[PDB]
Amino acid sequence: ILLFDEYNEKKASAQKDILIKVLDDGITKLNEAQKSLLVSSQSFNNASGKLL
Amino acid sequence: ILLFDEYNEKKASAQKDILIKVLDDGITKLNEAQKSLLVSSQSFNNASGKLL
Incomplete structure (x- = not known):
């Protein structure tokens, strides 16, 4: 500029x-930052079920 | 400009x-203009002598 x-x-x-x-x-x-983050979010999903 | x-x-x-x-x-x-002119000047020289 x-x-x-x-x-x-x-x-x-x-x-x-x-x-x-x-x-x-x-x-x-x-x-890549985004993908890294999205994958982290996906991680809790299984556990979140086991919890219920 | x-x-x-x-x-x-x-x-x-x-x-x-x-x-x-x-x-x-x-x-x-x-x-070339100049050369053309210079040569024209040179032209009178012979005649100028014959005159004298």
Whole structure:
């Protein structure tokens, strides 16, 4: 947001590559977080039955 | 001067090529003009002598 107040022609190609990696990365990391959590939730299910 | 008040990323490559051609071109054209003129000047020289 800062380096491209006014278009920076030289860093332009990197900034793009960067925006991609960091975004792409978090996107994956974020996803796995969710799956990890969902699976944890599923864990209690069996026990929850045995309880009843 | 106009189209690049603020850098125009798309036309950037053309503008460059253009600036080159038009400049390169006139540079040649301008040169030949001079030579043409210089030679014209040289023309009178022989006659100028015969006169004297």
